[PDB]
Amino acid sequence: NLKLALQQDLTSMAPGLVIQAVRVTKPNIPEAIRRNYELMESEKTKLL
Amino acid sequence: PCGTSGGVMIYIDRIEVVNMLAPYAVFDIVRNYTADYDKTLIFNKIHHELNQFCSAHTLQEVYIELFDQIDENLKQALQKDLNLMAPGLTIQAVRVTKPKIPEAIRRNF
Amino acid sequence: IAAQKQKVVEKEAETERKKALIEAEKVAQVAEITYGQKVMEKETEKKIS
Amino acid sequence: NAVYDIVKNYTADYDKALIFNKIHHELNQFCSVHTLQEVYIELFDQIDE
Amino acid sequence: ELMEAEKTKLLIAAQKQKVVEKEAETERKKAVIEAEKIAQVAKIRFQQKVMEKET
Amino acid sequence: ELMEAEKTKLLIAAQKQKVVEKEAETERKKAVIEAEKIAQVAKIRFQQKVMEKET
Ligand SMILES: *[C@@H]1O[C@H](CO)[C@@H](O)[C@H](O)[C@H]1NC(C)=O
Ligand SMILES: *[C@@H]1O[C@H](CO)[C@@H](O)[C@H](O)[C@H]1NC(C)=O
Ligand SMILES: *[C@@H]1O[C@H](CO)[C@@H](O)[C@H](O)[C@H]1NC(C)=O
Numbered sequence: 388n389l390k391l392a393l394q395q396d397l398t399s400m401a402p403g404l405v406i407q408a409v410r411v412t413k414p415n416i417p418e419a420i421r422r423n424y425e426l427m428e429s430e431k432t433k434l435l
Numbered sequence: 436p437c438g439t440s441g442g443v444m445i446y447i448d449r450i451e452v453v454n455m456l457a458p459y460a461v462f463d464i465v466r467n468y469t470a471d472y473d474k475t476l477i478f479n480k481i482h483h484e485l486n487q488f489c490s491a492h493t494l495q496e497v498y499i500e501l502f503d504q505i506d507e508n509l510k511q512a513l514q515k516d517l518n519l520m521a522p523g524l525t526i527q528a529v530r531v532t533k534p535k536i537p538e539a540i541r542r543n544f
Numbered sequence: 545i546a547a548q549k550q551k552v553v554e555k556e557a558e559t560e561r562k563k564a565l566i567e568a569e570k571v572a573q574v575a576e577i578t579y580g581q582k583v584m585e586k587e588t589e590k591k592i593s
Numbered sequence: 594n595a596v597y598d599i600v601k602n603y604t605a606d607y608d609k610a611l612i613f614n615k616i617h618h619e620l621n622q623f624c625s626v627h628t629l630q631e632v633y634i635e636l637f638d639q640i641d642e
Numbered sequence: 643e644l645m646e647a648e649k650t651k652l653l654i655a656a657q658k659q660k661v662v663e664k665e666a667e668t669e670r671k672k673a674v675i676e677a678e679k680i681a682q683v684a685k686i687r688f689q690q691k692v693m694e695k696e697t
Numbered sequence: 698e699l700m701e702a703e704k705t706k707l708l709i710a711a712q713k714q715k716v717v718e719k720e721a722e723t724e725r726k727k728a729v730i731e732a733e734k735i736a737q738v739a740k741i742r743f744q745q746k747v748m749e750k751e752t
Contacts, residue, residue, distance in 0.1 A: 410483040413438045419643060423650035424442030425537055428494055430657035431441070432543040434664055442650070453610070502625045506618070530618045546719040548648030550726065555652055557727050559659035561734035563666050568741040570670035575745050577677040579752040581684050588688040592695045 436482070437489035437534060439497055445534035447485065452477055452513070453528040460523020467521065476521055477513060484512045498534055505531050 390409040397404055416424075438444050454477065456464060468475045488508050489497055497505065510529040517524050536544075599607055620640075627636055 410480070412482070413436060413444075413486055416442075417643060417646075420646055420650055421442075423647060423654060425539060427650065427654050427657060428441050428443045428537075429539050429543060430654060430661055431493075431495070432540055433661050434657065435543075451614070499625055503622050528615075530615070532617075533621055545645045545648060546716060546723065548645060548652065550719065550723040552648055552651050552655060553723055553727050554730065555655040555659070557730040557734075559655060559662055561730060561737070562659060563662050564734050564738050565741070566663065566666035566670060568738045570666075570673050572741055572745040572748075573670070574673050574677045575749060577674065577681055579749055581681040583752060584681075585684060585688055588692060591692055 437485050437497065439489050439494045440491060441493050443494055443537060443540070445489075445494065445498065445536050447531055447534045449530075449532045450481055450485065450509070451530040452481070452510075452526060453530075454524060454526050456524040460521075464521060464523060472521065472524065476517060476524065477526070480513065480516070481509070484509055488512070494536065494540065498536060502531075502533070 389411070390406055393409070394406050397406065436444055436446050454473070464472050485505075488505065492501060506529040509531070510526050513526050513529070517526065603610060623640065624632055632640070
């Protein structure tokens with residue numbers, strides 16, 4: 388989506404400058420929310 | 436890093452790639468991407484491809500079940516782009532170590 | 545916050561409901577076995593009489 | 594006879610990249626399918642093969 | 643932040659319910675085994691009673 | 698100043714109205730679920746009672 392947006396903006400204003408690819412790292416979610424995600428996975432193994 | 440669909444992060448310690456390019460494509464490869472084509476074409480996309488693969492699988496599937504297929508999926512993902520963009524360079528093989536899991540999950544196992 | 549705590553409370557209540565149903569079925573099956581035993585005991589009591 | 598071709602395709606230190614870099618990956622793939630008991634006790638004699 | 647904490651807390655309960663179900667099922671199986679034990683012990687005791695009354 | 702403080706206190710009450718309404722609705726839903734649990738448990742118990750009376 389980000390690549391599509393950038394290319395759509397550029398195509399007319401600055402023709403000829405092509406955006407081949409875009410990459411992103413995984414976001415840094417807050418600590419409190421991250422702890423719950425770990426708890427969820429702890430329950431998936433407590434079942435085993 | 437690899438963020439599984441369960442919302443937990445597992446860090447794969449080492450992802451190795453073994454590649455090779457046919458001699459006749461050397462001129463074009465170095466013209467297009469210089470001599471750093473390895474870093475430009477493989478080892479910068481590795482982390483994004485791994486994250487994309489992990490986001491659709493749970494901790495169990497990546498850590499245990501689909502570990503037999505992590506390498507094949509990553510190799511196919513890399514080769515799909517390389518074939519179209521930089522012909523000649525091929526990924527002969529890929530290799531991945533077992534991901535590290537949080538202490539709490541490791542203890543339960 | 546309340547609109548989500550609502551769903552959390554609903555899920556916890558549903559979990560309690562499932563646990564109660566499992567306990568009830570356990571009691572039912574145990575009672576079935578006990579009453580089969582009672583019938584056998586009564587037959588033996590008839591023979592003793 | 595194949596020594597010339599082997600050294601041409603891969604450096605003199607071929608054995609590393611040809612065997613001992615894949616040993617750990619193959620072992621992990623084998624272990625992912627078998628439980629601890631099978632690898633430790635029962636299926637142990639089949640690991641070599 | 644709390645609003646987002648509740649969204650994940652809903653997901654934790656979805657697995658905790660499975661854990662609780664498994665524990666309750668294990669308790670049910672244990673109780674059933676105990677009931678069968680009692681039944682068989684009673685059978686033996688009552689055969690003994692019949693022999694007792696014959697004597 | 699207090700006259701203007703009271704004017705804003707009216708809005709806080711307007712929002713607290715919705716907050717307490719949502720809390721009461723959540724409690725209602727929880728109570729309804731508990732009642733359904735009781736009903737189903739009673740159904741199982743009474744089927745067991747019928748079987749016991751047959752025996
Ligand atoms: C430069 O700007 C002109 C005037 O808007 C435009 O017509 C032209 O396409 C632009 N070219 C590039 C390469 O940005
Ligand atoms: C080099 O780039 C050109 C133009 O994009 C492309 O047609 C060609 O296949 C590329 N060759 C290699 C070896 O990457
Ligand atoms: C070397 O690579 C060529 C590539 O065509 C292959 O055919 C040949 O068998 C290889 N020889 C070896 C590995 O000794």
